[PDB]
From a paper:
Immunization with AMA1 bound to RON2L, a 49-amino acid peptide from its ligand RON2, has shown superior protection by increasing the proportion of neutralizing antibodies. To advance vaccine development, here we engineered chimeric antigens by replacing the AMA1 DII loop, displaced upon ligand binding, with RON2L.
Clear, contiguous electron density in the apical groove of Fusion-FD12 enabled unambiguous tracing of the entire PfRON2L sequence. Moreover, RON2L in the fusion and binary complex overlay with an rmsd of 0.53 Å over 34 Cα positions. Overall, all the AMA1 loops (1b, c, d, and f) that pack against the C-terminal end of the RON2L sequence are highly conserved (rmsd of 0.21 Å over 76 Cα positions) relative to the binary complex. In contrast, some differences are observed in loops 1e/1a that pack against the N-terminal section of the RON2 sequence. Notably, the sidechain of E136 on loop 1a is displaced by 2.5 Å and no longer forms a hydrogen bond with the sidechain of N233 positioned on loop 1e.
Residue numbers in the entry: 105 to 392, 420 to 470
Amino acid sequence: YMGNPWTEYMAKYDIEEVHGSGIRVDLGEDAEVAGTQYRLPSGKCPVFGKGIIIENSKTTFLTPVATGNQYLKDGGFAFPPTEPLMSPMTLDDMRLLYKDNEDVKNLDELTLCSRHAGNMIPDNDKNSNYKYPAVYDDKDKKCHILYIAAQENNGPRYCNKDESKRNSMFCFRPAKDISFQNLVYLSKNVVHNWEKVCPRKNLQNAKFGLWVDGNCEDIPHVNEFSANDLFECNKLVFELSASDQPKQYEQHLTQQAKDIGAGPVASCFTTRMSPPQQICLNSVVNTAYKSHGKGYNWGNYNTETQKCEIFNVKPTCLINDKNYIATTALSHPIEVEAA
């Protein structure tokens, strides 16, 4: 074939190319709102099974952000109610909302959710390119626009883990956790044909390799870790994967906040898509480094020896092996299909 026969199938595993941003923490672009610059998610692939854990809270992150006189920790990350309604929104209501937008009405549910989230422009800057990320719940078929685009915050200086301090900034981190298995984390850039060009399911009886001299050889170096099941391996790969989070702390609070993706304060919005329309929150919100996709994004899970083999070089072929399942940080942590 005068070339690597695996090329078409393996294109979706070139995560620098097809995703192009962090996975664990995605903050791969910057956008301005009225002369202030903010970090925001920019990955082109959906991230299956990713949610945000809020430390020492029973409140889940898809809960609306605290508004009005609510305490910060009694809320989550999601858009609060708006007039007219925007989030959360069922797939069916999204299609109705955009029925007269030709280029949007028939998008697949994930791309539609992303475009829906990206419709609102903070009303302080009509020309802003700031677009909020979203989470789609595949079980409920419901799109949640995220008001908070930050994905990790830690350090006693920058958050407070104490449950009795209700209005102090909470600590949080991204995770693949069974409670998030039906969630899909979506940046503003998710491509319309993700079904074809991005990973989703784990590959049964296959392990990643490199195409060398007309044969598929093992990845030259892998890091082998104990992992009891495939889900645990997917979690380990996710934790090691491309990340746009700062590795250190900035002394100044406002600089650290910017660096972790603190965003604009908006109470009203306009729309990118016709018809032009004002959208306002029901209640105002509580007042209280780029990987470009490079990292340890891939794993070969040995189901016999219970070893997660994690590596940071893009794979270019598959090896048939009934003891292996091939995973990526983008992949769903449970779903599998045959190679």
